[PDB]
Amino acid sequence: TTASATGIATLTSTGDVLDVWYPEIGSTDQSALTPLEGVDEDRNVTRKIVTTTIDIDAAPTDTYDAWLRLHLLSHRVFRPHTINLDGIFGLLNNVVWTNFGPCAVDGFALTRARLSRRGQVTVYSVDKFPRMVDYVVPSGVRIGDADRVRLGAYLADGTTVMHEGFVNFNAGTLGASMVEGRISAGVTVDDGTDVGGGASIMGVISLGKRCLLGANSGCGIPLGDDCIIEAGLYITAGTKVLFDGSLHKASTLAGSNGLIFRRDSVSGQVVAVPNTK
Amino acid sequence: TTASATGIATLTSTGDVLDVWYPEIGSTDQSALTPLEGVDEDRNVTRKIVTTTIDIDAAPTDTYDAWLRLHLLSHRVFRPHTINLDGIFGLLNNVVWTNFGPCAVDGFALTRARLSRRGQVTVYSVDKFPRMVDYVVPSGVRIGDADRVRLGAYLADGTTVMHEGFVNFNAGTLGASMVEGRISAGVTVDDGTDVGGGASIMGVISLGKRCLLGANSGCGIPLGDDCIIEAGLYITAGTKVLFDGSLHKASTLAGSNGLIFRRDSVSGQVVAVPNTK
Amino acid sequence: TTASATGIATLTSTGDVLDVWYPEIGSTDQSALTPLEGVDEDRNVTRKIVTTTIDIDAAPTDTYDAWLRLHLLSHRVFRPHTINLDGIFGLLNNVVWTNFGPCAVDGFALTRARLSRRGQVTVYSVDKFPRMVDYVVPSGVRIGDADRVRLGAYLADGTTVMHEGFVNFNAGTLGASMVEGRISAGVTVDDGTDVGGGASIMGVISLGKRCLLGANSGCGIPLGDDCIIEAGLYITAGTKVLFDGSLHKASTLAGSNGLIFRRDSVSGQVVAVPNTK
Ligand SMILES: N[C@@H](CCCCC(=O)O)C(=O)O
Ligand SMILES: N[C@@H](CCCCC(=O)O)C(=O)O
Ligand SMILES: N[C@@H](CCCCC(=O)O)C(=O)O
C-alpha cells in the first residue's frame, strides 16, 4: 500500500533521526506542527516538519520510513504482520527518552548537565522503541503502566493492558482483550481472549478468540478459539501432552479449537481435554 | 460511617469529573487548595474546591463519592472490604494521566498538541484509576515502581512493594509485608506475610500472618497463618493436593494454618505438609 | 581501593542526605555542578558540592560514602561483590523520588502542596535506592522500563534489560545479556547469558556464560556455562532432579556446565541432561 503522512522529526547535528511524530495518518495539515519546529541547543537537536511516503510492502529504507510503519500499527491502520518491517532494527537509533524529549546516547552525560539548568532530568527508558502513548493513544483502550506498550503495538478497541501486561511492536490484540501478561513481538490474540497475570506468549504464534491463559501460564504454540491454559502451566512446543490416550509434543496440538490444557494428577502428565462448551 | 473531606476536583467543560484530590480526610481547611483552583484551557478543564460527604455503607452515587472512597482506603482510614464500592467502575472516567495532570480521552489528540507548546507531553497511564502516590503517600512504606500501586490500595506501615509487586484497589497489606508479586483486587495479606517475586494471589481470597509465597508461585485459595507455597508452584482452587494420604482439591485445604505446599518427587503429586514450626 | 569523586548532594534542613550525584568518577572538576547549587524552599533542601573519598574495602560510614559505592557499581568501575556494602541499608534514607527531584518523606504532604504551585507533582518511586538512569546511563545498554534498574546495578556493554527485566543493586550482567527477568541483589550473569521473560534468579548465586533461562523459569542455584532451564520450571536448591539415574537435590548440581534442566514425561521427574553442544 502507498502510505503517507506529515510529521515532525527530531534530528541530531549530524542528521541522525531520534524520532518522528505523525499526529495523523494521510494528512498534509501542519498547524499542529509549525509551532513545534525549532532548535534545542541543550539537546543539540533540531525539530523539523517532514512528509513521509512509503510502500508498505517494501522493506523500510531509512529511519523516517521505520517510524511511519510503527505509527501505522499503533494507529491501527495496519494489523500486525501486514506491513514489511525487515531491517527495522538497523534503522532505529538507540535514544534516551527523557522528560525533555528524545536525547542522543552519544554525549548524553553532557546533555544531562545542560538540561539540568532547566529542571530535574528524568530518564524514562533507553531504547530504539519509544513508549507508544507518547505518540498515539488509540481509542477505546486502557493501559495501566504505559511504559509497557511499545510504539508499533496494535491495541483494538475494548482492550485493557493491565500493569503486568506487556505488548511489543508488531503485536497485540485484534479485538477486546484483557492483557495482564506478555504479548511478544509478532504475537496476536483475537477478540475475547484474556491473558492472565504474568502469563507469557512466545513469538509464528497467535491465539484465536475467547482463549483464557491462567496467571503465570505460558503458551509457545499457536492456538485457535476457546482454549484454556491452566494457571502456572507452560505449554512449550516441546512439552509432552496426553491427548486421547497418547503423548504428543504440544506442537502436534497447535491450532486447536476448544482444548483445556491442565496438569493431571491421575496420569502424572500434562493433559489436553475438550472444553465443554 | 459518615465520612467527609474537602478536596479539589478537575472537571471537563461538560462537567465530567476527571479526578478529585483530598489531601486530608475530615478537614474543612482549604489553604493547601485555593491556589490550585483555576482553568487550564489547553486541557479544557477547571479545578474547583469541593466538599464531599458520604455514607460508606451505601453504594457510591457519583464520581466525587467514588474518589473519596479510594482515598479513604489509601489513607488507611478504612481497610479493604469495609467500604461499599459497588458500581464504582461505572462512576470513574477513563483518563489520560499526564505530566500536565489528568486529561480527557475525548479530544486527547488536540489536547496533546495544545500542551506540547508548553513542553514535552508524557503519558503515564490511561485508566480509570490513577497511581496512588500522586494523591497519597502513606507513612512507613516503600514502593519501587509507583506505577504499580493503584489509588484505593491499602499499604500498612512497614510494607515494601518491590518493582515486581502490584497492588490493586480494595487490596493490600494489613501489616508489615514484603510485596514482590501481585495482590489482586479484593485480596489482603496480613502482618509478616511476604509475597515472592512474580507470585500471583488471585481474588474471596486472603492470606493470614507470616505466610511465604515463593518466587513465581500462585495462590488461588484463602490461607491462614504460617503457610508456605514453594517457588514456581501455582495452587488453584482445583489443584489436586495430597494431604494425609488422600488427594483433595486445594479448596478443601482453604483457611489452613501451618501448611507447606510443595512438589513431591516420591508421589509425583503436589503435597501439603505441616510447617514445623 | 582508594576511590574519590566530586558530586552534588541534596540535604534536608536537618542535614540528612537525600541523594548525591557524582557525574564522573575520580574528577575534581565542578563546572557541570556549580550552577546546580542552591536552595529549594518548597522541598526545604539545599544542594551543595561535595568531595567524597572512600576505602572500598571498608564498610561505608555515612550516606555520602554509600551513594559513591552505588555510583562506582553503575559506572562499571567495580563489579558486583568487589566493594564492601555492609550496613548500606542503615545509611540510605527513604526518599520520595519526584519530577521535582528527591523529597523527604517527613513532611511530604506539605512539600507536595508547596510544589504543586509550580506544576503537577508526580511521584516515581518511594525508596532508599533511586532509578539508576537518573544518575548514570552506562554505555552500550538498553533499558525498556528504567524504573526497574536500581542505582548500584552493573550493566555491561551489550546488555538489554527488557521491560519485564529487573536488576537490583550489587547485581547485573558481566557481559552482553538479554535480561527479561529478575536479577536479585547479589546475582550476576556472565556474557551471552539470556534471562527469559518473567524468569527469577534468587540471590550466593551466579550464572556463567551462554546460559538460557526460559520464560517464567526460576534458578535458585549457581550454574556454570551453557546451562538451560526450561520455560516454566523453577529449580530451587531443594528441588529433586534426576541425573544419571539418581535423584539429587538440585544444590548437588550447583556450578555445573552444559546441563539442560527440563520436565520429563517418562520418569515424571525433573531431569538434568547434557547440553549437546
Ligand atoms: N522476544 C521478547 C524480547 C525481544 C524484543 C525485541 C528487542 O530486543 O528489542 C519479546 O518479544 O517480548
Ligand atoms: N483481576 C486482576 C485484573 C482486573 C483489575 C481491575 C480492572 O480491570 O481494572 C487484578 O485484580 O489484579
Ligand atoms: N531479594 C529481592 C528483594 C529485596 C531487595 C532489597 C530491598 O528490600 O530493598 C531482590 O533482590 O530482587
PDB file of N, CA, C and O in Angstrom, chain B residues 156-194:
ATOM      1  N   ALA B 156      -0.018  -1.006  54.717  1.00  0.00           N
ATOM      2  CA  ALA B 156       0.197  -0.742  56.170  1.00  0.00           C
ATOM      3  C   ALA B 156       1.605  -0.413  56.397  1.00  0.00           C
ATOM      4  O   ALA B 156       2.526  -0.827  55.642  1.00  0.00           O
ATOM      5  N   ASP B 157       1.804   0.339  57.473  1.00  0.00           N
ATOM      6  CA  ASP B 157       3.138   0.707  57.934  1.00  0.00           C
ATOM      7  C   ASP B 157       4.088  -0.508  57.987  1.00  0.00           C
ATOM      8  O   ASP B 157       3.744  -1.602  58.474  1.00  0.00           O
ATOM      9  N   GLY B 158       5.290  -0.360  57.431  1.00  0.00           N
ATOM     10  CA  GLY B 158       6.261  -1.444  57.297  1.00  0.00           C
ATOM     11  C   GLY B 158       6.263  -2.220  55.995  1.00  0.00           C
ATOM     12  O   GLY B 158       6.988  -3.179  55.862  1.00  0.00           O
ATOM     13  N   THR B 159       5.432  -1.853  55.041  1.00  0.00           N
ATOM     14  CA  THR B 159       5.329  -2.531  53.784  1.00  0.00           C
ATOM     15  C   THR B 159       6.324  -1.989  52.768  1.00  0.00           C
ATOM     16  O   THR B 159       6.450  -0.740  52.595  1.00  0.00           O
ATOM     17  N   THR B 160       6.958  -2.898  52.028  1.00  0.00           N
ATOM     18  CA  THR B 160       7.689  -2.568  50.817  1.00  0.00           C
ATOM     19  C   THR B 160       7.021  -3.242  49.654  1.00  0.00           C
ATOM     20  O   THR B 160       6.820  -4.487  49.683  1.00  0.00           O
ATOM     21  N   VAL B 161       6.645  -2.449  48.631  1.00  0.00           N
ATOM     22  CA  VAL B 161       6.196  -3.044  47.385  1.00  0.00           C
ATOM     23  C   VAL B 161       7.396  -2.904  46.474  1.00  0.00           C
ATOM     24  O   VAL B 161       7.800  -1.747  46.116  1.00  0.00           O
ATOM     25  N   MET B 162       8.017  -4.020  46.140  1.00  0.00           N
ATOM     26  CA  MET B 162       9.120  -4.007  45.196  1.00  0.00           C
ATOM     27  C   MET B 162       8.593  -3.765  43.774  1.00  0.00           C
ATOM     28  O   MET B 162       7.376  -3.747  43.468  1.00  0.00           O
ATOM     29  N   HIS B 163       9.520  -3.597  42.840  1.00  0.00           N
ATOM     30  CA  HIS B 163       9.210  -3.237  41.490  1.00  0.00           C
ATOM     31  C   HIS B 163       8.323  -4.248  40.824  1.00  0.00           C
ATOM     32  O   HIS B 163       7.472  -3.841  40.010  1.00  0.00           O
ATOM     33  N   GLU B 164       8.525  -5.517  41.089  1.00  0.00           N
ATOM     34  CA  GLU B 164       7.690  -6.602  40.612  1.00  0.00           C
ATOM     35  C   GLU B 164       6.344  -6.751  41.327  1.00  0.00           C
ATOM     36  O   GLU B 164       5.423  -7.346  40.807  1.00  0.00           O
ATOM     37  N   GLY B 165       6.237  -6.130  42.467  1.00  0.00           N
ATOM     38  CA  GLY B 165       4.974  -6.079  43.158  1.00  0.00           C
ATOM     39  C   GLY B 165       3.912  -5.244  42.424  1.00  0.00           C
ATOM     40  O   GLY B 165       4.207  -4.230  41.732  1.00  0.00           O
ATOM     41  N   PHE B 166       2.648  -5.585  42.725  1.00  0.00           N
ATOM     42  CA  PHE B 166       1.492  -4.862  42.142  1.00  0.00           C
ATOM     43  C   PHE B 166       0.371  -4.931  43.169  1.00  0.00           C
ATOM     44  O   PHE B 166       0.173  -5.992  43.716  1.00  0.00           O
ATOM     45  N   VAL B 167      -0.259  -3.812  43.481  1.00  0.00           N
ATOM     46  CA  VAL B 167      -1.401  -3.808  44.399  1.00  0.00           C
ATOM     47  C   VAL B 167      -2.537  -3.039  43.768  1.00  0.00           C
ATOM     48  O   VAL B 167      -2.395  -1.839  43.472  1.00  0.00           O
ATOM     49  N   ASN B 168      -3.655  -3.718  43.571  1.00  0.00           N
ATOM     50  CA  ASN B 168      -4.853  -3.160  43.032  1.00  0.00           C
ATOM     51  C   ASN B 168      -5.662  -2.400  44.091  1.00  0.00           C
ATOM     52  O   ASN B 168      -5.313  -2.350  45.261  1.00  0.00           O
ATOM     53  N   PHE B 169      -6.743  -1.807  43.683  1.00  0.00           N
ATOM     54  CA  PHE B 169      -7.610  -1.094  44.619  1.00  0.00           C
ATOM     55  C   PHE B 169      -8.331  -2.100  45.498  1.00  0.00           C
ATOM     56  O   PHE B 169      -8.501  -3.281  45.112  1.00  0.00           O
ATOM     57  N   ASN B 170      -8.868  -1.645  46.658  1.00  0.00           N
ATOM     58  CA  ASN B 170      -9.559  -2.549  47.564  1.00  0.00           C
ATOM     59  C   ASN B 170      -8.767  -3.786  47.928  1.00  0.00           C
ATOM     60  O   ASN B 170      -9.264  -4.905  47.982  1.00  0.00           O
ATOM     61  N   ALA B 171      -7.468  -3.569  48.172  1.00  0.00           N
ATOM     62  CA  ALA B 171      -6.491  -4.664  48.299  1.00  0.00           C
ATOM     63  C   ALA B 171      -5.269  -4.169  49.050  1.00  0.00           C
ATOM     64  O   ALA B 171      -5.054  -2.958  49.093  1.00  0.00           O
ATOM     65  N   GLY B 172      -4.517  -5.111  49.641  1.00  0.00           N
ATOM     66  CA  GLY B 172      -3.160  -4.764  50.113  1.00  0.00           C
ATOM     67  C   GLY B 172      -2.757  -5.472  51.374  1.00  0.00           C
ATOM     68  O   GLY B 172      -3.062  -6.663  51.594  1.00  0.00           O
ATOM     69  N   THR B 173      -2.007  -4.759  52.180  1.00  0.00           N
ATOM     70  CA  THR B 173      -1.313  -5.356  53.285  1.00  0.00           C
ATOM     71  C   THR B 173      -1.843  -4.764  54.567  1.00  0.00           C
ATOM     72  O   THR B 173      -1.861  -3.526  54.758  1.00  0.00           O
ATOM     73  N   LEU B 174      -2.153  -5.650  55.502  1.00  0.00           N
ATOM     74  CA  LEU B 174      -2.759  -5.235  56.805  1.00  0.00           C
ATOM     75  C   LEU B 174      -1.749  -5.018  57.878  1.00  0.00           C
ATOM     76  O   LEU B 174      -2.026  -4.289  58.874  1.00  0.00           O
ATOM     77  N   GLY B 175      -0.515  -5.433  57.604  1.00  0.00           N
ATOM     78  CA  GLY B 175       0.667  -5.260  58.470  1.00  0.00           C
ATOM     79  C   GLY B 175       1.942  -5.099  57.622  1.00  0.00           C
ATOM     80  O   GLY B 175       1.886  -4.659  56.479  1.00  0.00           O
ATOM     81  N   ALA B 176       3.087  -5.349  58.214  1.00  0.00           N
ATOM     82  CA  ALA B 176       4.370  -5.193  57.543  1.00  0.00           C
ATOM     83  C   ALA B 176       4.649  -6.389  56.635  1.00  0.00           C
ATOM     84  O   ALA B 176       4.848  -7.527  57.086  1.00  0.00           O
ATOM     85  N   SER B 177       4.660  -6.166  55.314  1.00  0.00           N
ATOM     86  CA  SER B 177       4.855  -7.238  54.318  1.00  0.00           C
ATOM     87  C   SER B 177       5.849  -6.796  53.245  1.00  0.00           C
ATOM     88  O   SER B 177       5.927  -5.588  52.914  1.00  0.00           O
ATOM     89  N   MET B 178       6.638  -7.736  52.752  1.00  0.00           N
ATOM     90  CA  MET B 178       7.436  -7.527  51.543  1.00  0.00           C
ATOM     91  C   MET B 178       6.587  -8.033  50.329  1.00  0.00           C
ATOM     92  O   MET B 178       6.196  -9.220  50.278  1.00  0.00           O
ATOM     93  N   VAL B 179       6.261  -7.161  49.406  1.00  0.00           N
ATOM     94  CA  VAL B 179       5.362  -7.472  48.302  1.00  0.00           C
ATOM     95  C   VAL B 179       6.138  -7.387  46.973  1.00  0.00           C
ATOM     96  O   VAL B 179       6.455  -6.307  46.527  1.00  0.00           O
ATOM     97  N   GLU B 180       6.465  -8.534  46.389  1.00  0.00           N
ATOM     98  CA  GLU B 180       7.221  -8.596  45.142  1.00  0.00           C
ATOM     99  C   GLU B 180       6.387  -9.245  44.071  1.00  0.00           C
ATOM    100  O   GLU B 180       6.866  -9.542  42.994  1.00  0.00           O
ATOM    101  N   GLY B 181       5.107  -9.465  44.370  1.00  0.00           N
ATOM    102  CA  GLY B 181       4.204 -10.134  43.487  1.00  0.00           C
ATOM    103  C   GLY B 181       2.870  -9.407  43.499  1.00  0.00           C
ATOM    104  O   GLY B 181       2.769  -8.311  44.041  1.00  0.00           O
ATOM    105  N   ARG B 182       1.866 -10.037  42.876  1.00  0.00           N
ATOM    106  CA  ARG B 182       0.608  -9.357  42.517  1.00  0.00           C
ATOM    107  C   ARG B 182      -0.536  -9.642  43.525  1.00  0.00           C
ATOM    108  O   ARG B 182      -0.950 -10.768  43.695  1.00  0.00           O
ATOM    109  N   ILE B 183      -0.989  -8.588  44.201  1.00  0.00           N
ATOM    110  CA  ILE B 183      -2.131  -8.604  45.080  1.00  0.00           C
ATOM    111  C   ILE B 183      -3.328  -8.058  44.294  1.00  0.00           C
ATOM    112  O   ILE B 183      -3.468  -6.841  44.082  1.00  0.00           O
ATOM    113  N   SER B 184      -4.190  -8.965  43.864  1.00  0.00           N
ATOM    114  CA  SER B 184      -5.377  -8.643  43.104  1.00  0.00           C
ATOM    115  C   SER B 184      -6.400  -7.853  43.845  1.00  0.00           C
ATOM    116  O   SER B 184      -6.353  -7.783  45.097  1.00  0.00           O
ATOM    117  N   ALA B 185      -7.366  -7.316  43.097  1.00  0.00           N
ATOM    118  CA  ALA B 185      -8.419  -6.551  43.808  1.00  0.00           C
ATOM    119  C   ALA B 185      -9.135  -7.422  44.761  1.00  0.00           C
ATOM    120  O   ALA B 185      -9.495  -8.584  44.457  1.00  0.00           O
ATOM    121  N   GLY B 186      -9.399  -6.898  45.944  1.00  0.00           N
ATOM    122  CA  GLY B 186     -10.120  -7.653  46.932  1.00  0.00           C
ATOM    123  C   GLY B 186      -9.229  -8.615  47.714  1.00  0.00           C
ATOM    124  O   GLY B 186      -9.716  -9.216  48.625  1.00  0.00           O
ATOM    125  N   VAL B 187      -7.932  -8.705  47.450  1.00  0.00           N
ATOM    126  CA  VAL B 187      -7.056  -9.569  48.234  1.00  0.00           C
ATOM    127  C   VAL B 187      -6.348  -8.803  49.343  1.00  0.00           C
ATOM    128  O   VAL B 187      -5.804  -7.700  49.078  1.00  0.00           O
ATOM    129  N   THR B 188      -6.273  -9.350  50.556  1.00  0.00           N
ATOM    130  CA  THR B 188      -5.426  -8.817  51.604  1.00  0.00           C
ATOM    131  C   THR B 188      -4.414  -9.903  52.078  1.00  0.00           C
ATOM    132  O   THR B 188      -4.740 -11.132  52.069  1.00  0.00           O
ATOM    133  N   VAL B 189      -3.243  -9.458  52.582  1.00  0.00           N
ATOM    134  CA  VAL B 189      -2.336 -10.343  53.296  1.00  0.00           C
ATOM    135  C   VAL B 189      -2.052  -9.710  54.644  1.00  0.00           C
ATOM    136  O   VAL B 189      -1.970  -8.471  54.752  1.00  0.00           O
ATOM    137  N   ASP B 190      -1.842 -10.516  55.663  1.00  0.00           N
ATOM    138  CA  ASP B 190      -1.682  -9.974  56.991  1.00  0.00           C
ATOM    139  C   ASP B 190      -0.186  -9.922  57.377  1.00  0.00           C
ATOM    140  O   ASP B 190       0.718 -10.345  56.607  1.00  0.00           O
ATOM    141  N   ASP B 191       0.061  -9.410  58.566  1.00  0.00           N
ATOM    142  CA  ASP B 191       1.370  -8.973  59.058  1.00  0.00           C
ATOM    143  C   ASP B 191       2.383 -10.072  58.901  1.00  0.00           C
ATOM    144  O   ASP B 191       2.170 -11.266  59.260  1.00  0.00           O
ATOM    145  N   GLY B 192       3.536  -9.694  58.383  1.00  0.00           N
ATOM    146  CA  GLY B 192       4.612 -10.630  58.211  1.00  0.00           C
ATOM    147  C   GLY B 192       4.577 -11.464  56.945  1.00  0.00           C
ATOM    148  O   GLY B 192       5.502 -12.190  56.670  1.00  0.00           O
ATOM    149  N   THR B 193       3.475 -11.446  56.229  1.00  0.00           N
ATOM    150  CA  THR B 193       3.372 -12.214  55.038  1.00  0.00           C
ATOM    151  C   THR B 193       4.276 -11.590  53.899  1.00  0.00           C
ATOM    152  O   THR B 193       4.266 -10.391  53.663  1.00  0.00           O
ATOM    153  N   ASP B 194       5.102 -12.420  53.244  1.00  0.00           N
ATOM    154  CA  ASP B 194       5.953 -11.957  52.151  1.00  0.00           C
ATOM    155  C   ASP B 194       5.564 -12.656  50.834  1.00  0.00           C
ATOM    156  O   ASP B 194       5.431 -13.905  50.758  1.00  0.00           O
TER     157      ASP B 194
END
